[model samples]
Target: HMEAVQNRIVEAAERVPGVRGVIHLRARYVGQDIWAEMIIGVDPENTVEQAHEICEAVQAAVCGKIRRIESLHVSAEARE
Candidate 1:
């Protein structure tokens, strides 16, 4: 059930435009925070500000829906 909650949030984030960044919806063995890596496929013409906005929106949506989320760390690089 916990994994399902995290996956749902991941899928939701991908729906945002230019926010093609959904790496892995995972969590630590002893934490409530869900760790997810995302790829912001912003248009070449897109500005950094827009990317930030998209990220913020995604973060808010996730945090809002997942009550136990304690922290979020988004990165440009993908994890192995």
Candidate 2:
């Protein structure tokens, strides 16, 4: 089961160029701004730099789609 905002994150994150899957994701309001954290599944062969770059894009993409969150921090791991 997923809520509207949760689906927004999944939807936005997956549309990026290199996203393979979303393992886990979250968002919360802090003193400075809303913050997001996500652990993503990616191609097993992706280089470290490539995965980092993809996650960076994922952060921007998520924030853009669900503007409620000010930042989204992402990490990547292999799918299989």
Candidate 3:
């Protein structure tokens, strides 16, 4: 169930970067919260901040798609 949500996030995030596709997407169900993490590779022209925004957009979309707890601290970081 949780994985489904995470998958959806990954799919959405991939659409963000016009360059490379999503490298990876991971998440964990902790207590009443889900810790979502994603690694996405975009064109060198894109900044890490842009990737993070794209991740957050997908994260928020996934959270909305799911029917679970309310609040969640969703964030993303850049990696090589």
Candidate 4:
């Protein structure tokens, strides 16, 4: 179950351009709800504004693909 969720998150995030990598993906059950958190690394070439759009895209993609997730928390970082 964990593996499936992790793979889904990685795949979804990777589909969005400007998202370079994903790290520290964590999922947990909080009172019958599934919550996910992860750190996304964006392309170094992108500006901060672009990275925010990338992060939002990643979140939207993941949420659309994974129906079990109640909350998806993403921390975005610019890759160096």
Q: All candidates' lDDT scores?
A: 0.61, 0.85, 0.58, 0.83
Writing each residue's lDDT as its tens digit, candidate 4 over 1-80 gives 57877898889988888777896688887876679988898777778788788878888989898888889988788677
Least well predicted 10-residue stretch by lDDT in candidate 1: 71-80
Model 2: how far is 41 from its true place, Å?
Answer: 0.8
Best by lDDT: 2
Q: For residues 1-80, write the lDDT of model 2, one tens digit per residue.
A: 33777888998999999898899887766764667789998898999999999999998888887867877789999997
**Candidate 3 error regions (>4 Å):** 17-19, 47-80
What's the lDDT for residue 63 in model 1? 69
Worst lDDT run of 10 residues, candidate 3, spans 69-78
lDDT of 2: 0.85
Residue pairs in clash, model 4: none
Query: Each model's TM-score?
Result: 0.63, 0.85, 0.53, 0.86
The stretch of ten residues in a row with the least summed lDDT in candidate 2 is 26-35
Q: Rank the candidates by TM-score, best first.
A: 4, 2, 1, 3
Candidate 2 wrong stretches, greater than 4 Å: 30-33
